[PDB]
């Protein structure tokens, strides 16, 4: 997908430090792969949560503003593209994705938004976004 590749390209451009400087900080966030046509509202939640995570005051302090704005534009386009194409099962899938973002939120707060903690999270989202969009 061109949109997916562009989203990843912008998240790669946002990188400030190398994860090679943070290899002892490897952390498993338990991305619920078990939840991923029926996966469209689940992928929608995933993109909305990436937008939420990178739109906080903490994210604005950590990453370049011009690159973040380009990133939001691409996430907006992805959300729009998904809207163009059992309710309780869908709710359950959405709740599992939300718990994964809750672990990321707690981790950044616990690590006091350090450069390594933000690079661990950025690399985590490069991986889970690639998986969720089956790129």
């Amino acid at each position, epitope marked *: 997908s061109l949109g997916s590749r562009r989203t990843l390209m912008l998240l790669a451009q946002m990188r400030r430090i190398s994860l090679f400087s943070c290899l002892k900080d*490897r*952390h*498993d*966030f*338990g991305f*619920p792969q*078990e*939840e991923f046509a029926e996966t469209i509202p689940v992928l929608h939640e995933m993109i909305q949560q990436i937008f939420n995570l990178f739109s906080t005051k903490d994210s604005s302090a950590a990453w370049d503003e011009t690159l973040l704005d380009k990133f939001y534009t691409e996430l907006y386009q992805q959300l729009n593209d998904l809207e163009a194409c*059992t309710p*309780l*099962m869908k*709710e*359950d*899938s959405i*709740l*599992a994705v939300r*718990k994964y973002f*809750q*672990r990321i939120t*707690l*981790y950044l707060k*616990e690590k006091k938004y350090s450069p390594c903690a933000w690079e661990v999270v950025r690399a985590e989202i490069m991986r889970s976004f690639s998986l969720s969009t089956n790129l």
Partner: single-chain antibody
Framework: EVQLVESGGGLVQPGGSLRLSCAAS????????MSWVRQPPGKGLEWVSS????????YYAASVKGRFTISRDNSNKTLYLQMNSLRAEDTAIYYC???????????????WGQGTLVTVSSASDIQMTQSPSSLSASVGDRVTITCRAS??????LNWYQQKPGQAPKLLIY???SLQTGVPSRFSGSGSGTDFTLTISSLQPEDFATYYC?????????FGGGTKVEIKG
């Protein structure tokens, strides 16, 4: 009033198949994720599988993936475990447990069923290290049990008490919250990687095995257990 009644346990030959049942009552079954947890003879607790409230999402321990299938019947309030390609490794008491949320992780197990025996005759990247493996104590002693996780699990660490021959019972959930009805002498503390369960003044009804359990991510994992025994 809340009950989980298990049945289906039996003596099965290797390779054959068997279905375990867990009949629920006294609670809204369809609003909760449910798990199976097993305990091989003389060994600790091992999480097997979880199924979300609506039955659409299932999670499995690496050792049973592809061989076991968890399912549920929300209208009949029954949880099932289909066990195929059965091995001696599968010989264990199987417990079903209600999860506190609609979907697994960041949650706890309460209550637990009575267990069902399965006898078959002839893996997590988060390690939970529980210390000590056993301790002797007198009535009135302060008892300290520690649990260390190989990475941060935030506050998602639960503690269970298991008397021999009985099902486990939740004592502390989310590192420090005391379960309703559990005496105030039990307390939990910690966050990140280091957690402690403290019994301020040990009573005779407290001699049991205690287990920590991370609920941060799947596979859900338990510590190796701590036996609290008498002192000479």
């Amino acid at each position: 009033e809340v009950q989980l009644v298990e049945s289906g346990g039996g003596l099965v030959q290797p390779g054959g198949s068997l279905r375990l049942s867990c009949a629920a009552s006294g609670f809204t079954f369809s609003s909760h994720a449910m798990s199976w947890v097993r305990q091989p003879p003389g060994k600790g607790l091992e999480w097997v599988s979880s199924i979300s409230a609506a039955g659409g999402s299932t999670y499995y321990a690496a050792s049973v993936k592809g061989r076991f299938t968890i399912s549920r019947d929300n209208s009949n309030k029954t949880l099932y475990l289909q066990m195929n390609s059965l091995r001696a490794e599968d010989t264990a008491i199987y417990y079903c447990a209600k999860e506190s949320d609609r979907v697994t992780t960041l949650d706890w197990f309460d209550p637990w069923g009575q267990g069902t025996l399965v006898t078959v005759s002839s893996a997590s990247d988060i390690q939970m290290t529980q210390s000590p493996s056993s301790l002797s104590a007198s009535v009135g002693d302060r008892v300290t049990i520690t649990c260390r996780a190989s990475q941060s699990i935030s506050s998602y660490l639960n503690w269970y008490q298991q008397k021999p021959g009985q099902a486990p019972k939740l004592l502390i959930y989310a590192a420090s919250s005391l379960q309703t009805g559990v005496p105030s002498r039990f307390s939990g503390s910690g966050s990140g990687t280091d957690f402690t369960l403290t019994i301020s003044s040990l009573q005779p009804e407290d001699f049991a095995t205690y287990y920590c359990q991370q609920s941060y991510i799947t596979p859900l994992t338990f510590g190796g257990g701590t036996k609290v025994e008498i002192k000479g």
